[PDB]
């Protein structure tokens, strides 16, 4: 799979993260990210995707070593961690054709797994609108503990 790059943007209290909601197959909430272009450096792709999806330019805030990277079904997703962005920042995607909405969420309220269906004796997981964000939540909480505490 082509690698994806983007950001986990936090506010000043470190309580809240910025998620984006797409359409169709991307109908739930997730961190802003997207696929790297040929010859494009990871930091430039993260900034490009984030600015296209949120209207906020992270370029001057990216730290090279501050990211969480996951490989999910043999596709690598790397989100640069961007703390301290004010909650009253006005975010606006470049294309309403791809982004429905942009919101801050409480980190402590976000799920870090989907729920099973063990009350129904059925296999699998119940739908969850935070599906794409979920894999990053525990690693983010662990990263924030180590970095700040
Ligand atoms: O990435 C997803 N959603 C967030 C997003 C939307 C638009 C973007 F441009 C960037 C991120 C996604 C993929 C599959 N699903 C599923 F849960 F519906 N969500």
Curated annotation (Swiss-Prot):
Residues at which Mn(2+) binds: 49, 53
Effect noted on mutating residue 52 to Q:
Loss of decapping activity
Location in or out of the cell: Cytoplasm, P-body; Nucleus
Nudix hydrolase domain location: 1-131
PTM (free text): Phosphorylated at ser-249 in a MTOR-dependent manner.
Q: In which tissues is it expressed?
A: Expressed in brain and testis. Not detected in heart (at protein level).
Task: Please tell me which stretches of this chain the record labels as motif Nudix box.
Answer: 34-55
| Family membership | Belongs to the Nudix hydrolase family. DCP2 subfamily.
Query: Subunit structure, briefly?
Result: Found in a mRNA decay complex with LSM1, LSM3, LSM4, EXOSC2, EXOSC4, EXOSC10, PARN, XRN1, CNOT6, UPF1, UPF2 and UPF3B. Forms a complex with DCP1A, EDC3, DDX6 and EDC4/HEDLS, within this complex directly interacts with EDC4/HEDLS. Interacts with DPC1B. Interacts (via N-terminus and C-terminus) with TRIM21 (via N-terminus and C-terminus). Associates with polysomes. Interacts with LIMD1, WTIP and AJUBA. Interacts with DDX17 in an RNA-dependent manner. Interacts with ZC3HAV1. Interacts with APOBEC3G in an RNA-dependent manner. Interacts with ZFP36L1 (via N-terminus). Interacts with NBDY.
Protein name, please? m7GpppN-mRNA hydrolase
The record lists the organism as Homo sapiens
């Amino acid at each position: 799979g082509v690698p994806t790059y983007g950001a986990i943007i936090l506010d000043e209290t470190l309580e809240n993260v910025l998620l984006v909601q797409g359409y169709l197959a991307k109908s739930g909430w997730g961190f802003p990210k997207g696929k790297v272009n040929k010859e494009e450096a990871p930091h430039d792709c993260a900034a490009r995707e984030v600015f296209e999806e949120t209207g906020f330019d992270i370029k001057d805030y990216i730290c090279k070593d501050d990211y969480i990277e996951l490989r999910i079904n043999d596709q690598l997703a790397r989100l640069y961690i961007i703390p301290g962005i004010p909650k009253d920042t006005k975010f606006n995607p470049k294309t309403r054709r791809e982004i429905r909405n942009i919101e801050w969420f409480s980190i402590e309220k976000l799920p870090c797994h989907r729920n099973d269906m063990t009350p129904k004796s059925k296999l699998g997981l119940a739908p969850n609108k935070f599906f794409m964000a979920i894999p990053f939540i525990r690693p983010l909480r662990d990263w924030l503990s180590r970095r700040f505490g």
